[PDB]
Amino acid sequence: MIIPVRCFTCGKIVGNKWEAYLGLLQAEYTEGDALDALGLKRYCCRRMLLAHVDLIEKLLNYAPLE
Amino acid sequence: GNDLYFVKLPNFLSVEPRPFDPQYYEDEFEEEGRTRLKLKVENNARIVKWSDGSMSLHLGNEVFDVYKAPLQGDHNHLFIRQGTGLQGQAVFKTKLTFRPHSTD
Amino acid sequence: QQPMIYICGECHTENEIKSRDPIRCRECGYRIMYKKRTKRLVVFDAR
Amino acid sequence: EKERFRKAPPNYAMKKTQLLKEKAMAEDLGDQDKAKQIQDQLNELEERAEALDRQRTKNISAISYINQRNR
Ligand SMILES: [Zn+2]
Ligand SMILES: [Zn+2]
């Protein structure tokens, strides 16, 4: 549903980097340079933001009220 | 002057073959009736050419994007055959080959 | 003196349903409705 | 009696109201009812679209931008 707080393999906090990653991709960044800028060096941590699919945006379309 | 301006509209966009004149128009037509009055009110035409190359139809506030399909299966020599000479004095203006299909 | 409050569906308005009552929303008409969260102690030893 | 003074479009009855208004316009052979239903449906659709865009104005607009940019 939502970006994991930590990389499964490493333990590095990647929960505060999904929105920043989306912003850097809002810029004309190539998909790898965004990860490089976010300080993600290991490929295990890079896969966290590469492969993540944000479904919580789709689940929030089902408003309980309003 | 002599350029292909052929367009093929569907049944629900049939434009009048003559200019709109108050002496040739009459009120005969009325969700069921909403598509009936649209035949003789919205249907004079200005085919806009855009920069991407495609065209569109402008018959009011709504714009229908059209594609000038160059179909080489009906190479009919379109001509203005009005009855003044011996029999349908066709004027050779342009041969119809490209059919533009408009749609909503 | 608790009337067993429910939450409607399409409405999301708390309704008071006692026994022998038809399950409908107090407004706008709704045959689906859910239950409120418990008041019991919810404690997760996060792990 | 509650629905009398309480507006129909509040709050989750919008889509159901849209379907019901379309059915009411379709079920009537009179042009006046069809035109009134069309105007009401257009107004309701505009209001609902504005409300939905306002709710999605933040955090969902951004990812839609970056998705169109991605493709
Ligand atoms: Zn890692
Ligand atoms: Zn009810």
Swiss-Prot record, chain B:
It comes from Homo sapiens. Belongs to the LEO1 family. Component of the PAF1 complex, which consists of CDC73, PAF1, LEO1, CTR9, RTF1 and SKIC8. The PAF1 complex interacts with PHF5A. Interacts with TCEA1, SUPT5H and CTNNB1. Interacts with SETD5. (Microbial infection) The PAF1 complex interacts with Zika virus French Polynesia 10087PF/2013 non-structural protein 5/NS5. The interaction with viral NS5 proteins may reduce the antiviral immune response by inhibiting the recruitment of the PAF1 complex to interferon-stimulated genes, thus preventing their transcription. This is RNA polymerase-associated protein LEO1. It is found in: Nucleus. Highly expressed in skeletal muscle and heart. Weakly expressed in placenta and liver. Component of the PAF1 complex (PAF1C) which has multiple functions during transcription by RNA polymerase II and is implicated in regulation of development and maintenance of embryonic stem cell pluripotency. PAF1C associates with RNA polymerase II through interaction with POLR2A CTD non-phosphorylated and 'Ser-2'- and 'Ser-5'-phosphorylated forms and is involved in transcriptional elongation, acting both independently and synergistically with TCEA1 and in cooperation with the DSIF complex and HTATSF1. PAF1C is required for transcription of Hox and Wnt target genes.
Swiss-Prot record, chain D:
Residues 29-63 form a coiled coil. Transmembrane segments: none annotated. It is found in: Nucleus, Nucleoplasm. The Plus3 domain mediates single-stranded DNA-binding. Component of the PAF1 complex, which consists of CDC73, PAF1, LEO1, CTR9, RTF1 and SKIC8; the association of RTF1 appears to be less stable than that of other subunits. At least in HeLa cells a N-terminal shorter form of RTF1 is also found in the complex. The PAF1 complex interacts with PHF5A. Component of the PAF1 complex (PAF1C) which has multiple functions during transcription by RNA polymerase II and is implicated in regulation of development and maintenance of embryonic stem cell pluripotency. PAF1C associates with RNA polymerase II through interaction with POLR2A CTD non-phosphorylated and 'Ser-2'- and 'Ser-5'-phosphorylated forms and is involved in transcriptional elongation, acting both independently and synergistically with TCEA1 and in cooperation with the DSIF complex and HTATSF1. PAF1C is required for transcription of Hox and Wnt target genes. This is RNA polymerase-associated protein RTF1 homolog. The lineage of its organism: Eukaryota, Metazoa, Chordata, Craniata, Vertebrata.
